[PDB]
Design a protein around this nucleic acid. Structure first.
Ligand SMILES: [Mg+2]
Lengths: 95, 106, 87, 96, 96, 82, 106, 95
DNA sequence: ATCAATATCCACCTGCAGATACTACCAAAAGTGTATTTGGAAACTGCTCCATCAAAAGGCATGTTCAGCTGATTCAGCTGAACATGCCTTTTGATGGAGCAGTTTCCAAATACACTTTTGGTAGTATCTGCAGGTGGATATTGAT
DNA sequence: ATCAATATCCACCTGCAGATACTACCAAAAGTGTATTTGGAAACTGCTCCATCAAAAGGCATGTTCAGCTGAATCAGCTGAACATGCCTTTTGATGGAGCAGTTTCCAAATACACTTTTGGTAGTATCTGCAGGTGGATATTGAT
């Protein structure tokens, strides 16, 4: 009865953080789900190519970060990089 | 037993993102930081688009975001618009916009 | 078992009214009377390309049924990415 | 017996259709067109309904955008009336 | 005392440059423009001699093709003189 | 004769580009529009090539940095590697 | 020892192509025919262009093919032109073409 | 020092099959090389996607063939498929 | 018309940049053979959802009428094309040294794996609520006069 | 200006499908804690080829002049918008089964070393030639008359 995965519960968490009294339709969620898969693939792709280009075989946060600078426009990139740098910093601090 | 998401401060699921990176065949190996960073980025972005969609929801006296609110949000934001410039949001409509010369009289 | 009716000329189900609605959503005030056939022709080319590619995916997977993913993937190749249907 | 002047209903329709998001081609005719064209590529094909809906959403968005560009080509020519030459210039410039 | 009509040279130039492929911008002023621009994203920067060449081939291929579309936009407006609005329209339609 | 760099891209050379593009007659405001446009093209592309440079930890922008940038901007160029 | 190219009837390097596919992270695995097929495909396309570029050299009194010939070849063929519609051949110029309304009166 | 690979020799060989008395400049060869890599990446890329869509771990000649169909215009696709199906045959029918 | 200025052509000549050809050499592929692993076609069949087919429901086709838009015609002015007459920038080549690319080391971070815990999805039965479509009532916009 | 036909507004009002809410259940995901491998950083280094600059090379800046284009204004013919009318197709909701997708079986084909062979690239040399860039001289093209 095979199980279909989606980012819905995460999307919903985050919805609540920014607009606590606001809901989302299932059609509007399918879209948010498209959106996340989409950007995932694009960034992962950019990083894929980027590693190959530099004969690296490992995709790290450094490759993600660049992929982000390449893919996103100015302000979104700057903010996205903060959040990525700081999530990593913080995750590394569990050690 | 801490999740990696909690460890990194994130709502979005790092375990999954790691998994999905492995199975996508993007590279032989996947660094530990990668899915953390990527999950954060993805979380950031969904937060941006919900902020803005939430507002259009509110601007239209509604409480539940539908795809029109996503389309309003995306298209009225220079940068999201560009990011999503070759993308179609089903059931989004278009921005109201009438070219000047088309309007009546002077 | 018993025999699916013939399909012809369905392009004309894209009516003058319905095209005019599309033009409106697209901000258009006045419409030359030759637009309706032109539009029919341009739509037909759009669909043949999306469908060719979708059906290629269908067959590649040895199915008889064109899925929403088949179309979504074909749209992506064509640079007309669509959200809402399995993206 | 009242009469709106030419253009006035058109602007009304523009405001209306730009505020809504429902599909504008009637569903069943569109579906037939899909089946007809697919059948010419291959026979004994079936479709998920959401596949047809996907095609319609994609098709309607493409055409609406095409008319925006087309409208800009007419206006460039100092007209208010879209003509085939406008659609064709759009499609030449677009890379189609 | 002999003078070519306006447009006659334009044509001769059109034919001459369509025949050929040499680049059409002096290499040096190009080199400075590049480095000027690149400076705003990182300082103290060298460039392979081929890297600058790639960039010049691309820029010229781009601008030449933009001029074709631009020209089509002028002709569309029943003109023969390219104007800034013609370039703007072409870029708008291309999606830039 | 301290001159701006963008202006190094001169009226006649613009005029020759147009000619290759089949253009017969050219309005005087073109040369400035055309420089504006080329600047945008180059900002967009150089940014990405450099970003490739920085990634590889180089001080030298390679032809590959450029070719790769061109590629992702939809402007695939042939003849300089890759 | 016989090369796989020679087994397949081909001038293009089946082994290389195989290697390139493994190291491209296109998939976990690679079947044996795929390199063969792909290699034949690239040989074929290569030949089609050199055929037409060759002709283009002839047509200009030339025995050495240069970029210009590849460009005329490609842009004078509907199919190659489409395949390459978003590609720029360095040093290829453009096709002689002048819009008819720009011609003088005759 | 490092071995800089190209398809140049394999291109030259096919030139002589097709135009035995015609030769080629360096620049022209570089473009041909670009071209082969490009088409390679495009096809392989499309094959990868196909396999992923159908949850397969292997890129076979079937994937390459469908890939070809998806990428090439009509007539070109046709001849390419035949050339591929052919070369696979000679290869199997050959110890 | 003719007539003359200038562009364009075709044939022939040549020097050397760019291409072919050499060989040697040698590392790193590509081929081979053996041992091991696993992906995915096949056979079988549970179960979704597609094609198909009546009962409800609002959009389409056509002809008539005329408002006003397009496109043809005219015309004056200003704006680019052409070209002379100076100005000065770019291109070409030579020559140190910055940095890129080669290479080797060794360890922090990777994959591998087994085993234990947690989670996110689904299913089933639950009751919960935003807003669309309806209502009516006050106001706005349009177009004739 | 005024009047009046009709769209537009907005506000609140009822029905219900779509959302939310819940407990029960589990497979697969994800975390944890070992054993084992290595990718790529670090640090030193040889050698391109890049920035620099001086000598040689020709293109671009300017101003004057006027041909001919763009755009304004005027007009008529005619195309396309609006609307009244009559006819029926699309939308929507309920069953029977075609095909897709979830199992399990298993072998033909894949990976994984290790091992032998070869070929494609580079470097050192020498060797060669297609054709760009002169040439002259004939003829076409353009533009004035
Ligand atoms: Mg048919």
């Amino acid at each position: 009865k095979t199980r279909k995965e989606s980012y819905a519960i995460y999307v919903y968490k985050v919805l609540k953080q920014v607009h606590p009294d606001t809901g989302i339709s299932s059609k509007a969620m399918s879209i948010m789900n498209s959106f996340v898969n989409d950007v995932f693939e694009r960034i992962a792709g950019e990083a894929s190519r980027l590693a190959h280009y530099n004969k690296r075989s490992t995709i790290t946060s450094r490759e993600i970060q660049t992929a982000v600078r390449l893919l996103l426009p100015g302000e979104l990139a700057k903010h996205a990089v903060s959040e990525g740098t700081k999530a990593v910093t913080k995750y590394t601090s569990a050690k | 037993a801490k999740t990696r998401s909690s460890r990194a401060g994130l709502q979005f699921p790092v375990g999954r993102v790691h998994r999905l990176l492995r199975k996508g065949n993007y590279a032989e190996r996947v660094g530990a930081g990668a899915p953390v960073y990527l999950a954060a980025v993805l979380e950031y972005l969904t937060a941006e688009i919900l902020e803005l969609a939430g507002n259009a929801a509110r601007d239209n006296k509604k409480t539940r975001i539908i795809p029109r609110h996503l389309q309003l949000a995306v298209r009225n934001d220079e940068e999201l618009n560009k990011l999503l410039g070759r993308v179609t949001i089903a059931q989004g409509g278009v921005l109201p916009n009438i070219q000047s010369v088309l309007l009546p009289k002077k | 078992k018993r025999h699916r009716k013939v399909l012809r000329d369905n392009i004309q189900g894209i009516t003058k009214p319905a095209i005019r609605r599309l033009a409106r959503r697209g901000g258009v005030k006045r419409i030359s009377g030759l637009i309706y056939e032109e539009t029919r022709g341009v739509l037909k080319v759009f669909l043949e390309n999306v469908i060719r590619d979708a059906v290629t995916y269908t067959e590649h997977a040895k199915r008889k049924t064109v899925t929403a993913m088949d179309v979504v993937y074909a749209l992506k190749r064509q640079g007309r990415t669509l959200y809402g249907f399995g993206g | 017996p009242h009469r709106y002047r030419p253009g006035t209903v058109a602007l009304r329709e523009i405001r209306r259709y730009q505020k809504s998001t429902e599909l504008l081609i009637r569903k069943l005719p569109f579906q037939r067109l899909v089946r007809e064209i697919a059948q010419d590529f291959k026979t004994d094909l079936r479709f998920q309904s959401s596949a047809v809906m996907a095609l319609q959403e994609a098709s309607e968005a493409y055409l609406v955008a095409l008319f925006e560009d087309t409208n800009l080509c007419a206006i460039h020519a100092k007209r208010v009336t879209i003509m085939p030459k406008d659609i064709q210039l759009a499609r030449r410039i677009r890379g189609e």
